[PDB]
């Protein structure tokens, strides 16, 4: 899915989408393609444990420093443990192995923090009709998050803009400075252009996706 994403982005960036005689970004807006999942909160505690996050359906997840993941579903009981090599086990809180009690405890600590203390990104948006965090890194400018369903999210720290890239829909959601959420089909930005702000963010995305590919 990453290879596809990189190709979609390269293709948009090659068409010089901000350099058209008239840019019609609004023509590319596609509400069909609004994603199902995105990361609405996150906490990096990789100094000790890992990266905690919440997805827009209120499921919570941790990627542990040992590259394993534990996910609590929005029902508050179902878990999925994903091992370093991707192997999945389905469990519950009411009846878990004791071997996972540490990780479930940690999971509850992230859950309570995120619930007590953080704002839900895209909270006004209805997603369209569960993945885990494959990986993440932070640059000086942003945090990049790569989900197991192929989605890449990027959150830029200074201005608080976010991009959500989905290679399945070949679509991008931009959350701008005023907290407006607009979703675009990549093939139509290729046709009708976009503003320099979005075009700049997409050039950066292209770059971050080639970092994800060499790791």
Curated annotation (Swiss-Prot):
Q: Which residues carry this modification: Phosphoserine?
A: 3, 78
Q: Where in the cell is it found?
A: Nucleus; Chromosome, Centromere, Kinetochore; Cytoplasm, Cytoskeleton, Microtubule organizing center, Centrosome; Cytoplasm, Cytoskeleton, Spindle
Effects seen without this gene: Lethality: homozygous embryos do not develop beyond the eight cell stage. Heterozygous mice are healthy and fertile but frequently develop tumors, most frequently lung-invading and liver-invading lymphomas. Analysis of chromosome spreads of spleen-derived cells from 6-month-old mice show aneuploidy.
The UniProt annotation puts the region (Important for interaction with phosphorylated proteins) at: 160-162
Q: Which family does it belong to?
A: Belongs to the protein kinase superfamily. Ser/Thr protein kinase family. CDC5/Polo subfamily.
Q: What is known of its domains?
A: The POLO box domains act as phosphopeptide-binding module that recognizes and binds serine-[phosphothreonine/phosphoserine]-(proline/X) motifs. PLK1 recognizes and binds docking proteins that are already phosphorylated on these motifs, and then phosphorylates them. PLK1 can also create its own docking sites by mediating phosphorylation of serine-[phosphothreonine/phosphoserine]-(proline/X) motifs subsequently recognized by the POLO box domains.
Q: Under what name is this protein listed?
A: Serine/threonine-protein kinase PLK1
Gene designation per UniProt: Plk1
Q: Shown portion of the whole protein?
A: 373 to 593 of 603
């Amino acid at each position: 899915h990453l290879s596809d994403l990189l190709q979609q982005l390269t293709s948009v960036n090659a068409s010089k989408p901000s350099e058209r005689g008239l840019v019609r970004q609004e023509e590319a807006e596609d509400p069909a393609c609004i994603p199902i999942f995105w990361v609405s909160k996150w906490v990096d505690y990789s100094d000790k444990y890992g990266l905690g996050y919440q997805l827009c359906d209120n499921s919570v997840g941790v990627l542990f420093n040992d590259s394993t993941r534990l996910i609590l579903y929005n029902d508050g009981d179902s878990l999925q443990y994903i091992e370093r090599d991707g192997t999945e086990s389905y469990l519950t809180v009411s009846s878990h192995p004791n071997s996972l009690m540490k990780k479930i405890t940690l999971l509850n600590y992230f859950r309570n923090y995120m619930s007590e203390h953080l704002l839900k990104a895209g909270a006004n948006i209805t997603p369209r009709e569960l993945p885990y965090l494959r990986t993440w890194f932070r640059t000086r400018s942003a945090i990049i998050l790569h989900l197991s369903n192929g989605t890449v999210q990027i959150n830029f720290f200074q201005d608080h803009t976010k991009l959500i890239l989905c290679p399945l829909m070949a679509a991008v959601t931009y959350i701008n400075e005023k907290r407006d959420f607009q979703t675009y089909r990549l093939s139509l930005l290729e046709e009708y252009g976009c503003c320099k702000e979005l075009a700049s963010r997409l050039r950066y995305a292209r770059t971050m996706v080639d970092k994800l590919l060499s790791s």
